[PDB]
Amino acid sequence: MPRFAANLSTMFNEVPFLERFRLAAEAGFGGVEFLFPYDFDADVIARELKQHNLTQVLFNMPPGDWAAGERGMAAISGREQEFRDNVDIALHYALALDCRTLHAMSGITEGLDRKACEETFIENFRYAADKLAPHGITVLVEPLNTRNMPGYFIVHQLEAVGLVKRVNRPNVAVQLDLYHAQIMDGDLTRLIEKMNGAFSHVQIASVPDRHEPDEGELNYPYLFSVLESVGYRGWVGCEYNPRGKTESGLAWFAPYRD
Numbered sequence: 327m328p329r330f331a332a333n334l335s336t337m338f339n340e341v342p343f344l345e346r347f348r349l350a351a352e353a354g355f356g357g358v359e360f361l362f363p364y365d366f367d368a369d370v371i372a373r374e375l376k377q378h379n380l381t382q383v384l385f386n387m388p389p390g391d392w393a394a395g396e397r398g399m400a401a402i403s404g405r406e407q408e409f410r411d412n413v414d415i416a417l418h419y420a421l422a423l424d425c426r427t428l429h430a431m432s433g434i435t436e437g438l439d440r441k442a443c444e445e446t447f448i449e450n451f452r453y454a455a456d457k458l459a460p461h462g463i464t465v466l467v468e469p470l471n472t473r474n475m476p477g478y479f480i481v482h483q484l485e486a487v488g489l490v491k492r493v494n495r496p497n498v499a500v501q502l503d504l505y506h507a508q509i510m511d512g513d514l515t516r517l518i519e520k521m522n523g524a525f526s527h528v529q530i531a532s533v534p535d536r537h538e539p540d541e542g543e544l545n546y547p548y549l550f551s552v553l554e555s556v557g558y559r560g561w562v563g564c565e566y567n568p569r570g571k572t573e574s575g576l577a578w579f580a581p582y583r584d
C-alpha cells in the first residue's frame with residue numbers, strides 16, 4: 327500500500343496552519359507536506375512534527391515575491407545569487423524538520439529566451455544538488471499545467487526528465503503530480519513506467535476539479551497499484567482542495583490510515 331502525506335497548505339484549512347498537524351495525525355496520516363514554512367519558526371514546526379508523530383515529506387524552497395505573482399526563480403537568468411541564498415534558507419528548515427526532499431520552483435518564464443532559462447535552471451539545480459548532497463537531501467522539479475499556471479517554465483513530464491539528465495546530479499529528480507500529468511500529458515500508466523526511477527515524490531488530486539482522489543476522470547486505486555508495481559516506495563502527497571470539510575472527505579483514505 328502507498329503511504330500518504332496530508333498537504334497542510336490545501337487540507338485542514340478549517341483551522342489555522344499550526345493546528346493542522348494535530349488534525350492530520352488524528353485522521354491517521356503519518357506524513358505531511360506543505361508549500362512554505364518560512365513565515366514560521368523552524369523550531370516550532372519541528373516540535374509540531376515531534377509532538378504529533380509526523381514525518382515532513384516535502385516543502386518548497388522560497389519562491390520570491392509570491393504576492394507580486396512570482397512562482398520561483400530557478401529558471402530566471404540574473405537571479406542566481408538570490409536562488410543560492412534561498413537554498414541556505416531552505417536547508418536550515420530541511421535540517422530542522424529532518425526533511426529529505428525539497429521542491430525548487432522555476433518561475434514564470436514566458437517572454438524570456440528559452441535557452442537562457444534552461445541554462446540557468448541547470449546551473450541553479452546543480453548548485454542546489456551540490457549543497458544538499460552532504461545532507462542526503464534531494465531537490466525536485468515539478469511540472470505544472472498551463473491552465474492553473476500559465477507561462478510556467480516546465481509543464482511536461484518527460485521534458486522535465488530530460489532537463490534532469492542535463493543537470494547530471496544523482497540527488498535531483500522529478501516531482502510527479504498526477505493531477506498536472508493528466509491535464510498536460512495523459513497516458514499515465516505507461517508514463518509512470520517510462521519514468522520509473524526518475525520521480526522521488528508523487529502528488530494526487532481529482533481531475534478536473536482538484537478534490538479528493540475518489541471522483542473524476544482518473545481511477546486512483548488503479549494508479550496506486552501501478553506505483554506499487556514499479557517499486558515506488560516514496561510518499562504520495564494529498565495536494566487537493568477538499569470538496570467540503572476535510573475529514574468528511576476521507577473515506578477514500580480509510581484503507582490506508584495509520
Ligand SMILES: [Mn+2]
Pocket residue numbers: 468503529565
Ligand atoms: Mn503539486
